[PDB]
Amino acid sequence: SPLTIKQPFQSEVLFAGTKDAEASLTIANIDSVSTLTTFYRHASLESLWVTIHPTLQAPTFPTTVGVCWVPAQSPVTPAQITKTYGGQIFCIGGAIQTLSPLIVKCPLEMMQPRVKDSIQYLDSPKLLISITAQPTAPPASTCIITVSGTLSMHSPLITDTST
């Protein structure tokens, strides 16, 4: 009933390749998702996926990057991606891993898409990242990792629109 709008978004979640790293972002808190839902009492994801953009360095420095979508309440960790259902490990900078649409869609049907409500949810989408770089590190990052999607929001939060 309340009018709703949909706003798409792409936020940079992690620049990588220069050193081994792990990440566990609950996408309900990524910058854009936040700046977007600022003036709304309710926000939910319509679509959502992770994407890996390779760079110049990628070719010279192969990088192992694993991603895995999971309900925020899943106890699994980056160290356990290939043990988890969504789990996928790519070899960016590697033979068939230096191409932009290196996408991994998030199975929202497998989790809770509401990212903003009158109540706090336990199973919102959460992303797991696991970068393992070349021992002899690259000058710069071999790939930029971003999270994109669409929010369906409604019911204005009465705050300050000064900014």
> Does 29 interact with a second copy (rule: CB under 8 A)?
no
> Does 7 interact with a second copy (rule: CB under 8 A)?
yes
> Does 87 interact with a second copy (rule: CB under 8 A)?
yes
> Does 144 interact with a second copy (rule: CB under 8 A)?
yes
What is d(CA 142, CA 163) in angstroms, rounded to the nearest whole number? Answer: 35
What is d(CA 140, CA 35) in angstroms, rounded to the nearest whole number? Answer: 29
What is d(CA 53, CA 101) in angstroms, rounded to the nearest whole number? Answer: 7
Q: Judged by CB under 8 A, which of 54, 115, 127, 129 binds a second copy? A: 54
Cα 115 to its chain centre, rounded Å, is 13
Q: Judged by CB under 8 A, which of 27, 98, 127, 130 binds a second copy? A: 98
* In the complex, minimum distance from the CB of residue 49 to a second copy, in angstroms, rounded to a whole number: 10
Residue type, 55: T
Instruction: DSSP for 106-148, please give it.
Output: --GGGS--EEE-SS--S--EEEEEEEE--SS--SS-SEEEEEE
Q: Judged by CB under 8 A, which of 16, 27, 36, 50 binds a second copy? A: 36
> Does 112 interact with a second copy (rule: CB under 8 A)?
yes
> Does 19 interact with a second copy (rule: CB under 8 A)?
no
> Does 127 interact with a second copy (rule: CB under 8 A)?
no
- Element (DSSP H or E) covering residue 31: helix 31-37
Q: Judged by CB under 8 A, which of 25, 50, 64, 129 binds a second copy? A: 64
